[PDB]
Write a protein that binds this ligand. Structure first.
Ligand SMILES: CCCCCCCCCCCCCCCCCC(=O)OC[C@H](COP(=O)([O-])OCC(O)COP(=O)([O-])OC[C@@H](COC(=O)CCCCCCCCCCCCCCCCC)OC(=O)CCCCCCCCCCCCCCCCC)OC(=O)CCCCCCCCCCCCCCCCC
Ligand SMILES: CCCCCCCCCCCCCCCCCC(=O)OC[C@H](COP(=O)(O)OCCN)OC(=O)CCCCCCCCCCCCCCCCC
Ligand SMILES: CCCCCCCCCCCCCCCCCC(=O)OC[C@H](COP(=O)(O)OCCN)OC(=O)CCCCCCCCCCCCCCCCC
Ligand code: HEM
Ligand code: HEM
Lengths: 72, 47, 380, 31, 49, 64, 15, 101
């Protein structure tokens, strides 16, 4: 329902045609810092549970391979 | 146990060539369509 | 002169649902998994049609029929492996869809989430019964163990055991009931999916920021149309990569033997997307307790909208609940790994600790974390 | 003017990778 | 007991992603099966065609 | 037989030699007849695992 | 004033 | 205390809605009480709020954030929706109290 969704006053939007602009304007040289910024802002909340459960997995397999070992 | 193995890998090679031809075109079309939104600039002047 | 697209009795439905539908501009790729789920369901039915219209599945020689499909039917291996790995990719996309809804505060739609929970029950049932159908060794043992689980309840367990099974081991007609409503129930899944679409079209989509997106909305075509086509091509790449290079990676060798009730299996498990659920049956030492534990896990998934004690919808501005959420996601990964491994030391106590951590995170830890987050924001 | 060249090239790299292994390579001494 | 040995990964001619089978090795293994292994084991789902 | 050639031409690797002398010292201390259920099992798997890892490293070069 | 506005420089995106 | 205030400011900076230029009251989930809190706002606060939401959606669409000079610092994040929301909550509470008896 375009036309009766919201009420916005005094805003200006500028846009270009896709045929008068580049499809990949400075792709790598402006995309690598943003990807590194997002990774630095999110890896401290995503990664440490995965590191702890990798430690849990390795400890479990180490105990399973250490289960009997011809016990004296 | 797997008599289809050679023809399976032949269809896999066909798939890899098909997707290597297709997916750059679809990605370029998506970037071309979304380049209007990714170039949009917004201004707000209250009275 | 009139516009054909807005006055046609059949095309106004398709453009109001597909073309000029206003969608949020800042939608990421995660919502695209939902669209992938739809087309994944479609190709399943297509392969399912190819698994019935040429084929003769038997109550006694089902496995012989399946190997005659793989060997003596043209492209039968291809459609069989697309059916199996499409079930696997369907559960991958369904898990990512559910996690999207769980993370971005999309559970505030009540009836949409409830019929999603119904759809999840239906796809669990279809996947389990489809795994029962080809009549392998460990498929038979899993069907026997879980029908011994469900036979305990009076007048609805026992009566349906004698209804879905002519005899407990084998007689002249056993698997045709499993085949019958594994055949019909994905069409109920498709009907509940179009009800899912109807309710979402009533309420509108949701942005990842969780705010009112009505300031910036765009037509669905041609932005999200080409985004969905790109996602479908990437999904089909991965799907027949799993089909056509590594067909027995997400699968298992233990069901590639004929069924023999005299021969016990050394290691028994369900498929991978059932595995963590199987771990809950290894958690509580009660069969009825395990059944109610499965029902309670999907019921607290349905009950999650009542636990939203925060005044911020999405979790982009909620770091404590984000940390709790990723702890929960890794806890389900640990639960899948535990459900894979057999019942010994100390996998029993890892199962106990993982199950109580899962229930504590979903029940009590997340609303208290939201209360702490709201208290630290000078809100109350 | 590409589909027959597409299938021919995919087949050509398939027997270039697997030279001396497929059945068509050994339809000389086994016929 | 419960202790087992994991077999290693031999460098097969079909181990690779695009690697095909050696069909003369399949023929030689077939006459091995016919001349040795066919007295006890079976190939119930395999025909001569 | 080429795998036998592989067996004595990489038996002299230090880890499978070490597991081999673990196996012979176990064979020494089980022949004392201690009437137990104790065997030379795990080090036998360790020696076979090391020698089969060496074989799968370099078996198929001399084969047809 | 509507004459006080002008389009921004799109030089980093334009060809 | 002072250390609680420091961890509060650190948590505000790590929440991440100051990177998109959003204020604190813009991020409230639009329930019914919040909807008639917005409906009772004056025109200038409402227009600034709508521009802030639209700018946040525009920045989220390109996966970008504002420069650090343009971020919302702690002192200017005032509480403009707080009296409207609290009186809406109070009148809803007294309506519920009247309907209870
Ligand atoms: C170092 C690595 C390279 C980094 C790099 O080039 O960064 C530049 C650039 C940086 O982008 P940015 O500056 O952050 O802003 C654009 C955003 O990335 C957002 O824009 P976008 O370009 O990422 O597009 C949104 C998204 C749209 O996503 C989709 O359409 C896919 C939807 C999900 C499909 C899931 C399939 C099943 C998965 C199961 C697991 O696109 C993709 O996910 C890329 C698909 C690429 C397909 C192959 C193309 C050749 O990185 C990319 O564009 C990422 C994709 C690179 C390919
Ligand atoms: C995937 C691994 C994590 C990747 C990652 O870093 O994601 C970050 C992203 C959150 O980033 P966001 O805050 O949205 O954006 C910041 C922009 N300035 O995170 C996201 O967008 C996460 C979205 C998906 C969340 C779910 C992922 C797990 C899916 C399985 C859940 C299972 C739920 C239960 C199902 C069975 C019952
Ligand atoms: C410090 C920089 C390091 C890198 C150097 C280079 C610099 C990179 C750029 C850094 C920029 C600054 C940081 C930006 C990220 C945002 C802030 C952040 O993440 O802070 C760390 C966070 C603090 O917590 P926060 O949510 O912010 O709130 C504090 C309130 N007390 O704390 C955390 O996120 C820690 C969470 C730890 C969770 C551990 C969970 C372990 C247990 C999981 C078990 C799961 C399975 C259970 C199984 C049971 C059965 C066995
Ligand atoms: C209504 C359409 C469907 C029909 C007619 C159908 C029919 C069949 C048949 C005949 C089989 C046995 C053949 C085989 O095992 O390869 C089978 C297997 C299976 N089906 Fe379906 N199916 C349908 C939809 C689905 C859906 C939607 C799912 C996903 C939830 C699904 C999951 C499975 C699974 C997991 C197997 C076992 C595959 C295996 O042997 O590993 N099926 N189905
Ligand atoms: C049975 C398989 C399912 C299919 C085919 C399916 C299909 C879809 C489709 C096509 C959409 C719209 C695309 C989008 O915007 O994400 C969607 C959205 C949604 N689905 Fe599903 N869905 C399924 C399962 C579920 C389940 C199990 C849940 C509940 C956890 C769920 C909850 C939602 C929600 C909340 C949205 C709205 C997204 C938002 O605006 O935030 N879906 N689904």
């Amino acid at each position: 329902e375009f036309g009766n969704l919201a009420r916005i006053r005094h805003v200006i939007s500028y846009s270009l045609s896709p045929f008068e602009q580049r499809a990949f304007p400075s792709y790598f040289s402006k995309g690598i810092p943003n990807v590194l910024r997002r990774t630095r802002e999110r890896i401290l909340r995503v990664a440490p549970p995965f590191v702890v459960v990798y430690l849990i997995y390795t400890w479990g397999n180490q105990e399973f391979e250490q289960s009997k070992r011809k016990n004296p | 146990s797997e008599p289809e193995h050679d023809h399976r890998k032949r269809m896999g090679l066909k798939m890899l060539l098909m997707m290597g031809l297709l997916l750059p075109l679809t990605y370029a079309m998506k970037r071309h369509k979304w380049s209007v939104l990714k170039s949009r600039k917004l201004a707000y002047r209250p009275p | 002169m009139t516009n054909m697209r807005k006055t046609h009795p059949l095309f106004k439905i398709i453009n109001h649902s597909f073309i000029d539908l206003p969608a949020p501009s800042n939608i990421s790729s995660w919502w695209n998994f939902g669209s992938l789920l739809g087309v994944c369901l479609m190709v399943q039915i297509i392969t399912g049609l190819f698994l019935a219209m040429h084929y003769t599945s038997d109550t006694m020689t089902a496995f012989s029929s399946v190997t005659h499909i793989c060997r003596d039917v043209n492209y039968g291996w291809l459609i069989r492996y697309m059916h199996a790995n499409g079930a696997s990719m369907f559960f991958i996309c369904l898990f990512l869809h559910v996690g999207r809804g769980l993370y971005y505060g999309s559970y505030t739609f009540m009836e949409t989430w409830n019929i999603g929970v119904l759809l999840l029950f239906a796809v669990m049932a279809t996947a389990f019964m489809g795994y029962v159908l080809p009549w392998g060794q460990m498929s038979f043992w899993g069907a026997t163990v879980i029908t011994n689980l469900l036979s305990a309840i009076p007048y609805i367990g026992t009566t349906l055991v004698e209804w879905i099974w002519g005899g407990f081991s084998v007689d002249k007609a056993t698997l045709t009931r499993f085949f019958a409503f594994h055949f019909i129930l994905p069409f109920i899944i498709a009907a509940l999916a179009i009800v899912h679409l109807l309710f979402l079209h009533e309420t509108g989509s949701n942005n990842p920021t969780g705010l009112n997106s009505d300031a910036d909305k765009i037509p669905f075509h041609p932005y999200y149309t080409i985004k969905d086509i790109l996602g479908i091509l990437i999904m089909f790449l991965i799907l027949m990569t799993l089909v056509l290079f590594f067909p027995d990676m997400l699968g298992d060798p233990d069901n590639y033997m004929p069924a023999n009730p005299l021969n016990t299996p050394p290691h028994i498990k369900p498929e991978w997307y059932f595995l963590f659920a199987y771990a809950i049956l290894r958690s509580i030492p009660n069969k009825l307790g395990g059944v109610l534990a499965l029902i309670l896990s999907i019921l607290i998934l349905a009950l999650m909208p009542f636990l939203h004690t925060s005044k911020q919808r999405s979790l982009m501005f909620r770091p404590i609940t984000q940390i709790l959420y990723w702890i929960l996601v890794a806890n389900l990964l640990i639960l899948t790994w535990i459900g894979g491994q057999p019942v010994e030391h100390p996998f029993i106590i890892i199962g106990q600790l993982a199950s109580i951590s899962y229930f504590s995170i979903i029940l009590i830890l997340m609303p208290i974390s939201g209360i702490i987050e709201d208290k630290m924001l000078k809100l109350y | 003017f590409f589909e027959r060249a597409f299938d021919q090239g995919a087949d050509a790299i398939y027997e270039h990778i697997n030279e001396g292994k497929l059945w068509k390579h050994i339809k000389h001494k086994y016929e | 007991s419960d202790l087992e040995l994991h077999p290693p990964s031999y460098p097969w001619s079909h181990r690779g992603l695009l690697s095909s089978l050696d069909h003369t090795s399949i023929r030689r293994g077939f006459q091995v099966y016919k001349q040795v292994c066919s007295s006890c084991h079976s190939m119930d789902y395999v025909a001569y065609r | 037989d080429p795998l036998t050639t592989v067996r004595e031409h990489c038996e002299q690797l230090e880890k499978c030699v070490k597991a081999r002398e673990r196996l012979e010292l176990c064979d020494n201390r089980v022949s004392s007849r201690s009437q137990t259920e104790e065997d030379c099992t795990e080090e036998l798997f360790d020696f076979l695992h090391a020698r089969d890892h060496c074989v799968a490293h370099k078996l198929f070069k001399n084969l047809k | 004033s509507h004459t006080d506005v002008k389009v921004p420089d799109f030089s980093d995106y334009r060809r | 205390s002072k250390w609680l205030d420091g961890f509060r400011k650190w948590y505000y900076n790590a929440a991440g809605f100051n990177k998109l230029g959003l204020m604190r009251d813009d991020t409230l989930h639009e329930t019914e009480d919040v909807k008639e809190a917005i409906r009772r706002l004056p025109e200038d606060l409402y227009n600034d709020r709508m521009f802030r939401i639209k700018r946040a959606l525009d920045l989220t669409m390109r996966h970008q954030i504002l420069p650090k000079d343009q971020w919302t610092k702690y002192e200017e994040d005032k509480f403009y929706l707080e009296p409207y929301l609290k009186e809406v909550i109070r009148e809803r509470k007294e309506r519920e109290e009247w309907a209870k008896k």
